[PDB]
Ligand binder design. Structure first.
Ligand SMILES: Cn1nc(-c2cnc(N)c(-c3cnn(C(N)=O)c3)n2)nc1C1(c2ccccc2)CC1
Length: 820
């Protein structure tokens, strides 16, 4: 039992638990015991939660950021149902009462004892909220479907819960002895060092002696800083390069250990290959000890030297610049530090960037203001998670301020918070305890936290950390671990199936490959593995019976698979699909879609539903991911091919899109699809201009039969190949309802673009903090300031609301003139 769980975690996280112990590292050993225990206490509090609190954990509510409707209600142990004509202003409790009365009259004889489960879904409807505030109700009111819900009693939810149980006295200057190395190159070799407190130097970059390629130095490198004035998060960074410039390898390390003690004596640093100095990189050596260039160095003794505790630390024209600053302006902010705490608390980030981290008296002065610093908003707190604020007490404060994050806000920023783990100096950190804690209190946070870490297990710089966090998570969730093993089981099968489709497509016809994909899919093991799991894209979505005849593959380079599902219990809402792609990095796609989804949230909060399609996209492994099938859609390209004996047969290529809409929306149903198209077009015109989505062509823009426009293939963003605003004649034609001149519908569409644009600019900083935290990912198109800059200009964040609107009008007008 205890052994099987250990072998289950190993297979699931894709790294044997025997490997962690084989390193014999006390830090890895300390994190494992402490986090195992932390996660087991969370598991314990959970198994005692009330039945409603278990619904908030296992099935958290999907809420939207009057008018009549038909709803179908049945009960758990019967096929018998009742269809009611209720209102969007009614709470679930009233519908639950109607359902219990209709039961009493059929069965010839309390609502607070039930929850409404969404049929064939891991979704529920409970709490004091009108029906239209629920995502499932809106997805029914929009598509034209009748919600199907089952009355689940308190005892059946409790049965689920139960079945799912488990110092200053050192004034000398800092120095190291650079002994030798064991690398490969073909010239002389120089080892440049540097002391860093995040993205900033504590002193200048002291270089080494030019020793020949054949390498021994044995030099005492002296740094321009004192041993008493080393910050706790001091980072000694190295770089090895060849000269007659060519980078070879880099390596970083902390001067204090996880137990706050200054390190001694000999250190062999297994270096990471280079693409000058890299302070942002991992402080753990390359795990490929056999094929890695190593650097031996000495950490001289100073006699145990522990970093002082907080009790010792604690004992030891201004308004015009508060909206990069000069050396005199910095001195002003630092002298005024007490006034900044009391009258400008949100300016904290600017005060943290002016304190001299190269002087221990200055740090304690800053930290004294910080320990009495009032709580900052979520927006201020997301800025302090950057590697630009590396201090542990700053990070602890940032986490403290982020504790007020709702489960909806935390879920929206989970990708950025997972990325910040790459910046952490030590294994046991506040961020992990916060993620793991918040994961174990919410199965949906826990699901996605797992997939974010699992997706990168093949990346050796994070493999140890990500694997230890997943192991700690499984300790606190034995049932979920098995639920996620089922998802990896389907994915292991989709990878072997896709490898066959790849080989087969280069040897035979598509109908021949398709038929054999079906014969392989219909094998016992494939039928079991691909059916009856939760969707890695959405835990609330249940992938029940796999529809083998409806499955195929797409013709693009990597032969993506088209896997269809159906569920008897769910009805039409159970007809779902996933696209399995293997070969491309899907990280940037996920980020771009999450940023569009965030835009849709900020628009919906202000009462604007621009009819957006934020379809799921999730990396699951090495160059492997899933995309969500948006049902009843097709590319602009396909529609425009204009084939004969079809309902979309056009006399002119321009009419193809409008004829396609007419054929799918007959009669009075057409006018709504023109509005759907107009709103979605405006939202994607803003999203693509703001995010710099270039290289747009008819085969990467899609339309739903409902009229809704949306983009696919986000392989390029932030201007990478200054992208101008885009307007296609083929779309303006549809907005104008097939008229040459129609300004009434064009200006209302221009209004949508203007309104959408302004709303985004007000949260411009939120996109700025989130994209800055994202630099930790290693996306080749999100690597520097020139990438974050594109967003600063696209949103004209410097300018006022009226100045930016005119600048946008020039961008919107230049797109219209470019439209043939
Ligand atoms: C009908 N239909 N629906 C889609 C569809 C639906 N939802 C999506 N999210 C995406 C998507 C997103 N990214 N992406 C990608 N990178 O490839 C694809 N595509 N595609 C088709 C087509 C198809 C399907 C199967 C076999 C041949 C041709 C006609 C192309």
């Amino acid at each position: 039992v205890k052994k099987l769980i250990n072998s289950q975690i190993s297979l699931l996280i894709g790294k044997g638990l025997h490997e962690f112990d084989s390193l014999r590292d006390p830090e890895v050993n300390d994190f494992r015991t402490k986090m195992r225990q932390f996660c087991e206490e969370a598991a314990a509090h959970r198994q005692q939660l009330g039945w409603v609190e278990w619904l908030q954990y296992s099935f958290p509510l999907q809420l939207e950021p009057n008018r009549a409707l038909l709803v179908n209600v049945k009960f758990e142990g019967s096929e018998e149902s009742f269809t009611f004509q209720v209102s969007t202003k009614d709470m679930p409790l009233a519908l639950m009462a109607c359902a219990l009365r209709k039961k009493a009259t059929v069965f010839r004889q309390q609502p607070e004892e039930y929850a409404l489960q969404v049929n064939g879904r891991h979704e529920y409807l409970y709490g004091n909220y009108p029906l239209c505030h629920f995502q499932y109700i809106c997805s029914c009111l929009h598509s034209g479907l009748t919600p199907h819900l089952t009355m689940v009693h308190s005892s059946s939810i409790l049965a689920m819960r139960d079945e799912q149980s488990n110092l200053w006295s050192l004034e000398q200057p800092f120095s190291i002895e650079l002994i030798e190395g064991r690398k490969v190159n073909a010239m002389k070799l120089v080892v440049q060092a540097g002391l860093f407190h995040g993205n900033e130097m504590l002193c200048k970059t002291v270089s080494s002696s030019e020793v020949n390629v054949c390498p021994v130095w044995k030099q005492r490198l002296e740094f321009d800083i004192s041993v008493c004035d080393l910050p706790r998060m001091a980072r000694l960074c190295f770089a090895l390069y060849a000269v007659v410039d060519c980078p070879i390898a880099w390596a970083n390390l902390m001067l204090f250990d996880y137990k706050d003690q200054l390190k001694t004596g000999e250190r062999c640093l297994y270096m990471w290959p280079s693409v000058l100095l890299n302070p942002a990189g991992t402080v753990r050596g390359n795990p490929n000890t056999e094929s890695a260039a190593a650097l031996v160095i000495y950490l001289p003794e100073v006699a145990p030297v522990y970093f002082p505790a907080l009790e010792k630390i604690l004992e030891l024209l201004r308004e015009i610049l508060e909206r990069e600053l000069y050396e005199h302006e910095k001195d002003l902010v630092w002298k005024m530090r007490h006034e900044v705490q009391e009258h400008f608390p949100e300016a904290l980030a600017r005060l943290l960037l002016v304190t001299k981290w190269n002087k221990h008296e200055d740090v304690a002065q800053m930290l004294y203001l910080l320990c009495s610093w009032p709580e900052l908003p979520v927006l201020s707190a997301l800025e302090l998670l950057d590697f630009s604020f590396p201090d542990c007490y700053v990070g602890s404060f940032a986490i403290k301020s982020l504790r007020k994050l709702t489960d909806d806000e935390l879920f929206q920023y989970l990708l950025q918070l997972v990325q910040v783990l790459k910046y952490e100096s030590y294994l046991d950190c506040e961020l992990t305890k916060f993620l793991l804690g918040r994961a174990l209190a919410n199965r949906k946070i826990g699901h996605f936290l797992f997939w974010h870490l699992r997706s990168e297990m093949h990346v050796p710089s994070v493999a140890l950390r990500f694997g230890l966090i997943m192991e700690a998570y499984c300790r606190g969730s034995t049932h979920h671990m098995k639920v996620l093993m089922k998802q990896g089981e389907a994915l292991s099968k989709l990878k072997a199936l896709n490898d066959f489709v790849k080989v087969s497509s280069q040897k035979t016809t598509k109908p021949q490959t398709k038929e054999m994909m079906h014969m392989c899919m219909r094998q016992e093991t494939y039928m079991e593995a691909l059916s009856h799991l939760q969707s890695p894209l959405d835990p609330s979505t249940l992938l029940e019976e796999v529809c083998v005849e409806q499955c195929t593959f797409m013709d693009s380079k990597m032969k993506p698979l088209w896997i269809m599902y159906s569920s008897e219990e769910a009805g039409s809402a159970g007809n779902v699909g996933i696209i399995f792609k293997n070969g491309d990095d899907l990280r940037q796609d996920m980020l771009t879609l999450q940023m569009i989804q965030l835009m849709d949230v900020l628009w919906k909060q202000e009462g604007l539903d621009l009819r957006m399609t934020p379809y799921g996209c999730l990396p699951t492994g090495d160059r492997t991911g899933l995309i969500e099938v948006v049902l009843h859609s097709d590319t602009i390209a396909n529609i425009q091919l204009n084939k004969s004996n079809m309902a979309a047969t056009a006399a002119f290529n321009k009419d193809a899109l409008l004829n396609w809409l007419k054929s799918k929306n007959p009669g009075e149903a057409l006018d709504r699809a023109i509005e759907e198209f107009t709103l979605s077009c405006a939202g994607y015109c803003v999203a693509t201009y703001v995010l710099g989505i270039g290289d747009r062509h008819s085969d990467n823009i899609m339309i739903r039969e409902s009229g809704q426009l949306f983009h696919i293939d986000f392989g390029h963003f932030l201007g990478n190949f200054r992208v101008p605003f885009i307007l296609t004649y083929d779309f303006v034609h549809v907005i104008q309802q097939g008229k040459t001149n129609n300004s009434e519908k064009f200006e209302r569409f221009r209004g949508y673009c203007e309104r959408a644009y302004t709303i985004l600019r007000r949260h411009g900083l939120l996109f700025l903090h989130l994209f800055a935290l994202m630099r930790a990912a290693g996306l080749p198109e999100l690597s520097c300031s020139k990438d974050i800059q594109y967003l600063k200009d696209s949103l004209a964040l410097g300018k006022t609301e009226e100045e930016a609107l005119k600048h946008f009008r020039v961008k919107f007008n230049e797109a219209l003139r470019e439209s043939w």
